Design a protein around this nucleic acid. Structure first.
Length: 185
RNA sequence: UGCUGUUUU
C-alpha cells in the first residue's frame, strides 16, 4: 500500500532530522551551527538535503514538510512559506552542568563484540528491541577503522539497567561484553 | 582550567 510505505518513510525522515538538531549532535556540528546563526534558527531545505543520510531517504521538499507536520516529538517547526525549518525556542539545548553530565553518564553503556565490517545500519537494527536509544558512537582507531566496540546513550537509567542486567546477549554467533561506562576504562 | 579538531556533515 503506497500510503503505508509513505508513512514508514516519513517516520524515518523525522527521526533523522531530529537527530541532527538534537542534544547529542548539534553542539558538536560546526557546519550545522554555521547555518543556524543566520536567521533566528531557520535553515533552508536546500541546505538540509545535502546531509547524506537525509539525501538517501528523499530530496522532495513536500515530503519533508509533510513528515515533520505529523511528528510526535514536537521538536521541529516549519516556516510560513514552508522553505525553512528550525528547532523550537521552547526546546533549548541543556546547560552543560555537573548535574547534567552525571545524569547522562549514569545511562551510558559500553558494548564490545561487533565485527569490524558492521555498519551503523547493522547496529541500529540489532538495537531495535532493546529500549529507547538517543546516541550511538562507533569507536575507531587513528586511521578511522572500526574497533568493534561502541558507546550508547539510553533514554533513562531504568532502560539502561534493564539492558545491562540481561544475561545471554549475542550479535549473531558471538558473545558480547557489556559494561556501564562508569565500569569501562 | 583553557585551546583545537571531530560526516548519523
Amino acid at each position: 500500500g503506497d500510503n503505508e510505505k509513505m508513512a514508514a518513510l516519513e517516520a524515518k525522515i523525522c527521526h533523522q532530522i531530529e537527530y541532527y538538531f538534537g542534544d547529542f549532535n548539534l553542539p558538536r556540528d560546526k557546519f550545522l551551527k554555521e547555518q543556524i546563526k543566520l536567521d533566528e534558527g531557520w535553515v533552508p531545505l536546500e541546505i538540509m538535503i545535502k546531509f547524506n543520510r537525509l539525501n538517501r531517504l528523499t530530496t522532495d521538499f513536500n515530503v519533508i514538510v509533510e513528515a515533520l507536520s505529523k511528528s510526535k516529538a514536537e521538536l521541529m517547526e516549519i516556516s510560513e512559506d514552508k522553505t525553512k525549518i528550525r528547532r523550537s525556542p521552547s526546546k533549548p539545548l541543556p546547560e552543560v552542568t555537573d548535574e547534567y553530565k552525571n545524569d547522562v553518564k549514569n545511562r551510558s553503556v559500553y558494548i564490545k563484540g561487533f565485527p569490524t565490517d558492521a555498519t551503523l545500519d547493522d547496529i541500529k537494527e540489532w538495537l531495535e528491541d532493546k529500549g529507547q536509544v538517543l546516541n550511538i558512537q562507533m569507536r575507531r582507531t587513528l586511521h578511522k577503522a572500526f574497533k568493534g566496540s561502541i558507546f550508547v546513550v539510553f533514554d533513562s537509567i531504568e532502560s539502561a539497567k534493564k539492558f545491562v542486567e540481561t544475561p545471554g546477549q549475542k550479535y549473531k554467533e558471538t558473545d558480547l561484553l557489556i559494561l556501564f561506562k562508569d565500569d569501562y576504562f
